[PDB]
Amino acid sequence: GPAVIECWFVEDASGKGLAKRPGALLLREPPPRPDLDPELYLSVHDPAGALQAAFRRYPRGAPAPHCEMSRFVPLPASAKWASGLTPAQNCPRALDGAWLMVSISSPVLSLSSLLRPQPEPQQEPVLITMATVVLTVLTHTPAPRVRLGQDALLDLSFAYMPPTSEAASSLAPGPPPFGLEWRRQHLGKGHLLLAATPGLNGQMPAAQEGAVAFAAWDDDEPWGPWTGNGTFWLPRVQPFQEGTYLATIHLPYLQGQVTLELAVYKPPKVSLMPPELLCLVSHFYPSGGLEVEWELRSQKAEGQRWLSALRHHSDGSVSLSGHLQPARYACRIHHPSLPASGRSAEVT
Amino acid sequence: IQRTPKIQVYSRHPAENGKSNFLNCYVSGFHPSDIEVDLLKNGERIEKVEHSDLSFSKDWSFYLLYYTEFTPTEKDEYACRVNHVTLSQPKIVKWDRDM
Amino acid sequence: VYFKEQFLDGWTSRWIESKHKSDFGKFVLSSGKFYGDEEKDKGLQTSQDARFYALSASFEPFSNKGQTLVVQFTVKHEQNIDCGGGYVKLFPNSLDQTDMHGDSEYNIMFGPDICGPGTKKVHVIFNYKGKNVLINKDIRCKDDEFTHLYTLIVRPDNTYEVKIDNSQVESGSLEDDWDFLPPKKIKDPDASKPEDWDERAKIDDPTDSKPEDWDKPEHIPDPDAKKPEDWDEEMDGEWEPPVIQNPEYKGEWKPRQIDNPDYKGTWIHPEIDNPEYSPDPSIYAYDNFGVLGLDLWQVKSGTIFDNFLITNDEAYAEEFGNETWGVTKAAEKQMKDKQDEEQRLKEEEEDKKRKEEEEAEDKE
Amino acid sequence: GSHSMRYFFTSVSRPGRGEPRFIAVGYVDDTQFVRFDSDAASQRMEPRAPWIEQEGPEYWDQETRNVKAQSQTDRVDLGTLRGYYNQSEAGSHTIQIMYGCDVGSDGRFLRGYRQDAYDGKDYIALNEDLRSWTAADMAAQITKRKWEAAHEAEQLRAYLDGTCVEWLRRYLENGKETLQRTDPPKTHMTHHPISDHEATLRCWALGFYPAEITLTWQRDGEDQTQDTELVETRPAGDGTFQKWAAVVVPSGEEQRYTCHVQHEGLPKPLTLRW
Amino acid sequence: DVLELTDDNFESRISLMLVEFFAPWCGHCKRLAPEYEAAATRLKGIVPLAKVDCTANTNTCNKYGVSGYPTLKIFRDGEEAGAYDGPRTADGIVSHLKKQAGPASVPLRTEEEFKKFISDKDASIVGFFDDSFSEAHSEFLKAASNLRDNYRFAHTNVESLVNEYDDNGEGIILFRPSHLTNKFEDKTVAYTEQKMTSGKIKKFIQENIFGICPHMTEDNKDLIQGKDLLIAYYDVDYEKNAKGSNYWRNRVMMVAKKFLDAGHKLNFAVASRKTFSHELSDFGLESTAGEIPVVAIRTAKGEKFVMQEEFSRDGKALERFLQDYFDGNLKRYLKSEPIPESNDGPVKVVVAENFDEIVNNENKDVLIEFYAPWCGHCKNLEPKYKELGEKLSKDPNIVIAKMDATANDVPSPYEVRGFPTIYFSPANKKLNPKKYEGGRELSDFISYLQREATNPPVI
Ligand SMILES: *[C@@H]1O[C@H](CO)[C@@H](O[C@@H]2O[C@H](CO)[C@@H](O[C@@H]3O[C@H](CO)[C@@H](O)[C@H](O[C@H]4O[C@H](CO)[C@@H](O)[C@H](O)[C@@H]4O[C@H]4O[C@H](CO)[C@@H](O)[C@H](O)[C@@H]4O[C@H]4O[C@H](CO)[C@@H](O)[C@H](O[C@H]5O[C@H](CO)[C@@H](O)[C@H](O)[C@H]5O)[C@@H]4O)[C@@H]3O)[C@H](O)[C@H]2NC(C)=O)[C@H](O)[C@H]1NC(C)=O
Ligand SMILES: *[C@@H]1O[C@H](CO)[C@@H](O[C@@H]2O[C@H](CO)[C@@H](O[C@@H]3O[C@H](CO)[C@@H](O)[C@H](O)[C@@H]3O)[C@H](O)[C@H]2NC(C)=O)[C@H](O)[C@H]1NC(C)=O
């Protein structure tokens, strides 16, 4: 796909607020562009193989990915359940150098890679600050749309390459244990849906709301870069489970967090009843976005009309009844879930 | 995230003939605060409509309670009209005794 | 009258295009889709998107030393520009009209420069001692498609006044809002904060003394220290009542140490006249002005320039700026509203057509 | 039951009038006791409840400076956020903050949360675990790193377990006459013949407190949660609340249809029949 | 206050000395930074302190082998020494630094100094050598140097002290802490050998410093843990409730001494519940928070034993548990959810509690399936496994099982790396289960139980 991702280096210093500077990545003769700041122009050399292959097949002509970069230093996982990941009181030496959270929030696939760059930009070659990817967390469905009542599959594939350093801590050659953590943040709810630590053993917080995650390294090779699977299988998606589902891959002093908005849609059913016409709408979701239109078959129906309050069914789906007071008379419902033409109902 | 207001017109007491009551138009769930809620007595705006403070809610939405006194009568149909930044045309919700 | 331009095709005789680059944009004489008058609003307009422009006009050389200089011009952003500039530049006699590059040797730059929401400010830059100096003040420049007047006045007392639409928008002195001689008053480096000058002042025992009541023992025997009956002091040696921290323990004896006592305020280094200060009264003066140029990069072409005036009298420029811009503005805005109503009618018709096509597709 | 105490702050950017509007309120249960309104000329924590009225003016000035400084920080935060999101200055944008704690019936700590939300989209929140923050976008991620750097989670944990809960007990004790009170609903139930083949039965939970009530329609002893209709609890105007539940029924079959009303102030769940 | 010991001047200024390697990004170093500064202020003159920002000078950490941050390491006269193994708080650093400041064996010059030294909260080895050139004193000096980081050594030559102690040469006496005095065990133990040898003295101290019932609370932590021990956890704060601690340790002491006279090997210890509250989780003891002392056993092999019975003030429960353990009847306590008595169903619900009863059964072939709740693979495999169970319920010799592997510790050679893993244990092969890593289909399962199990499977 695009070999140059125009991005935005968000600065984290409190004195300068959240000021943005330019600076663009470069996947895979590096094309030079002097406009960018030499510190924030990274030639992403990816040994994991996940990011460059993911955006290699990314559709051509797509809008520019909404990349956002910033500096972050590795702080240990705050949640108690992840303590097993970091049980020592000393920070490993392999985490030397700077760390950048590159969150490519493209409309088709999210991502959150951890780039550890080199100290200085290239002098003899073009101004490129070489960098290495460590933990890529790519989601293939950044905005799923599950019909009410069925289950949702929140894709989440991560890839890890251990930080290469002089000291090799190969005590247990193979895939290190990690902690997956899914979390819904819908208008001040903040429920911990599930937290898992494959490989390691401990008393995890109970998976809530029937959620199960396929969290397991696909490979078990002793050294090779490991591409794990962390999809979220939430069954019977009810309206209260709508919202952004941020998923975090926890590694020793590493966090890869990506969000995705799970929109729930339930196509309505319409009915005209016998004078004052009552366009009654059956169970549907989401509550908003509905637009009643009236037609005398055709032309816009004359006569004054009003709406009814949302009669919340306990499941979450709502139902309203538009009343009009004035061949055939038809009411057309305009809801995003149903075909935008409108599942209209007519009485002749 | 411009959520639409959810009008709920009612009265503090069930409607009865010749008894004062409070047509509390309860507008809730909207965002942002740019709102105008006017009660109507058979199509015309009511002048003395005391409103309550822009009370906030836990789910990041406001809710106002525009209440005015009236004597439930079977000749006029009280209504609540609400215009906002998200809804295209001011919603007009009639006051129903049963609902 | 240093320079006058109303565009009332002879302008190409007095306007010249540089040949420094092979991709310079082409200017066209036009009044735009909407205007206040068909002929009065005629002016140069960019007609090529995402290209550089360089157009310069020569005139009689003159100097601003000892006399007020006023520049005046109207810019129309009818195309709703997203990135570009309406600024103009004053060049000396030595400037080459045919070789005007992106940044030629100029004296004063005055006019808007808009490229995105963040940048929406008037860029006024002056040359002094081989340096381009911008203003430290944030002058906001109008962004809507209507024509907007812009005026600069500099009196020989190194004072400046910037006006927008015949209305005063900024005023001040050159030697105070720029970086000509930034050392004006320097704080004394050796003026360190004295040890006796307390900043976080605190006085102990203002209206209190040692209570001696809170000075209770740290650990006291437990009130319910009942020895177990099965305990044998013979085998245990000597049973003792368990002791615990007393509820009456406090922070020793704090005599209500309150703040803001005998406070002389925060100490600062006193400032003295900087010896590096050297403002010049002739800062506003220039050797000569020979060319009026406009070298600007515009992503979306359609910017109209008209009503150029360079003179020495404030009232003269103000009167002509009024009698041109104000006369234009009315008919401009009413006609514009008329065509906007026509456009909105067309959009509503298109929306109705789309809705009926969608309904027809639904019926099938 | 469980009680709540919350504090809300809301900076609404009003383009054309200079400084953004700033509204700060405090809620014990769902009854406000302080409301600092920036638009009003008083510009103080004007009280609205008896349990807060009997406070010395020094306390009022303390909350005054507190909320003033919070507003001074919040307006700069709104400005920098509006700059970050790349959004038009002409539009009105809202930034909201809230912090509070929930106690159980025994008075001990039960829950604590502080949340921030820009434009109504949850910005950054403190987990109910009181240990880790959750951040949706990356501006919230930067703010999360900033908080974790200072270990202010150990500060808020001090407040939420401490001063928040202590103030909540003090308010519930001084104002025990009006907040700890519960009131059973004066329930009704009505019939409406929508047609000759169906009818609507609507049981009214009317005039109760607090709003945590549940109405369910047992059909022949089995809860028919699927086809029951209900409106959200609506304030009545004089402090209490009122709700409304409904069910569609075959005409003239009102034998086995029980509107269970459950409320804290009731001695036991009640049963209704027509 | 400390000097930054970068590489270019490291060996120049390393020439005791305490240097802490640190990395600015890590929160651990910044947490102890004010504590480290306070320790430097409180240890001026005795031991110099220094900071090293390893992120700049890689050579220092590469040579010193410092793979962590912080990794406080002491340098005795510019010579690498043992890493500081203790709390990173200022108080602990100061305590260990003052311990290092003194010589290997403290030379007592006055009798009052002798009482002051033996009055310390920890055990104290004291040597009495009238002759300065005696080989016993030199051997004691090397013994002190070798075992310095574990025991408090002192030596003296006062005539009264030497005469009141041994007065025959190699006068090594171990004074146990003054707050740990008891009856059945003598407070003072004398060294009895022909010649004082560093190895012999070290072995003598290792076998005699603990006696029967030591108070091990964050000190001597390794010196006791590692053998077949017995820890009683209970409120242990002497400066506030020394009487209760003495009472409970005396109970444990008398029962332990009774069984020691009976002639069995089992070391004992008492611990404060708060200090070792982290270790209470390993024994599944939560937080008793009561005056009753909880008692637990770990053996050298790693087995864990817990009393469900309350620790009686008479001591009957203690001796009962001791004789039970010596007989060897109680089952190792592994973290196990309370098994339901309703183990009915096509698939048998196995827990670590009854894994031996069900899975380790001798006259049946069992197929077990380790599964986790959040495991999506296991949730997907559950219905097929249930159908397998209901189909093969007619086979008496074979039963399939599932044991939750996150809330129930997997026992036996059985080991799970990735859920869901399935294992097959034949009737006469309980020691060598086979890991069924083939397909995951119901028909494949039926085929496998047709291939392996001797008894013909049912449908
Ligand atoms: C929110 O989201 C919106 C999207 O909707 C963002 O909008 C985008 O904004 C970017 C800019 O940030 C736009 O990028 C533009 O892309 C064009 C091609 O697509 C570029 O041609 C254009 O290039 C300008 O910027 C680059 C980078 O800064 C410069 O290198 C380049 O030269 C252009 O800048 C010149 O032109 C500007 C406009 O005229 C001037 O303001 C600027 O100063 C600079 O001027 C030079 O060129 C002129 C002409 O030759 C010279 O005369 C000048 O010299 C004279 O003036 C200087 C001082 O200015 C004196 O020192 C000197 O003495 C004088 O001679 C200069 O040499 C853009 O990069 C993008 O198109 C937008 N998209 C949309 C859809 O709108 C928005 O940015 C977002 N918000 C935030 C906050 O990020
Ligand atoms: C991560 O794990 C999930 C869950 O195990 C994988 O999703 C599902 O994986 C199965 C196994 O390959 C897929 O089944 C396949 O289905 C196709 C079409 O139905 C069929 O032709 C194949 O023979 C096979 O049975 C399934 O499609 C797939 N997706 C679902 C269930 O939505 C996922 O592939 C794993 N890897 C990731 C996410 O990178």
Author numbering:
A (entry chain T): 1 to 28, 33 to 278, 291 to 313, 320 to 348, 358 to 379
B (entry chain B): 1 to 99
C (entry chain C): 4 to 11, 14 to 369
D (entry chain M): 1 to 274
E (entry chain E): 2 to 16, 23 to 466
Quote the study's own text.
Major histocompatibility complex class I (MHC I) molecules are central to adaptive immunity. Kinetically stable pMHC I complexes are ensured by stringent peptide proofreading and quality control processes, which are orchestrated by the peptide loading complex (PLC), a highly dynamic multi-chaperone machinery in the endoplasmic reticulum (ER). The other PLC constituents, namely calreticulin, tapasin, and ERp57, function in recruiting and stabilizing peptide-receptive MHC I clients, whereby tapasin serves an additional outstanding role as peptide loading and exchange catalyst. Upon binding of β2-microglobulin (β2m) to the MHC I hc, calnexin is replaced by calreticulin, which recruits the mono-glucosylated MHC I to the PLC for peptide editing and quality control.
In this study, we determine the 3.7-Å single-particle cryogenic electron microscopy (cryo-EM) structure of the PLC editing module reconstituted in lipid nanodiscs (Nd), which enables us to identify pivotal features of this supramolecular chaperone assembly. 3D variation analysis depicts that one editing module was always fully assembled, showing tapasin, ERp57, calreticulin, MHC I hc, and β2m, while the second one was displaced and lacked some of the PLC components. As major interaction hub, tapasin contacts all other PLC subunits. In addition to the non-covalent interactions, tapasin is disulfide-linked via Cys95 to Cys33 of ERp57. The high-resolution structure allowed us to build an atomic model of the N-glycan bridging the lectin domain of calreticulin to Asn86 of MHC I hc. Whereas Met114 and Ile130 of calreticulin shape the glucose-binding pocket, further contacts to the N-glycan are established by Asp118, Asp300mc (main chain), Tyr92, and Trp302. A well-resolved loop of tapasin (residues 11–20), henceforth referred to as editing loop, is positioned on top of the F-pocket of the empty MHC I peptide-binding groove. Thus, the structure suggests that Leu18 disrupts the contact of Tyr84 with the C terminus of cargo peptides and thereby contributes to peptide exchange catalysis. Direct contacts in this region include Arg187 and Gln189 of tapasin, as well as Asn127 and Asp122 of MHC I. The latter residue also forms a hydrogen bond with the main-chain of Gly192 at the tip of the tapasin β-hairpin, which additionally interacts with Lys58 of β2m. In contrast to TAPBPR-MHC I complexes, the empty peptide-binding groove of the PLC-bound MHC I is in its widened conformation stabilized on both helices, not only by multivalent protein-protein interactions with tapasin, but also by glycan-protein contacts via calreticulin.
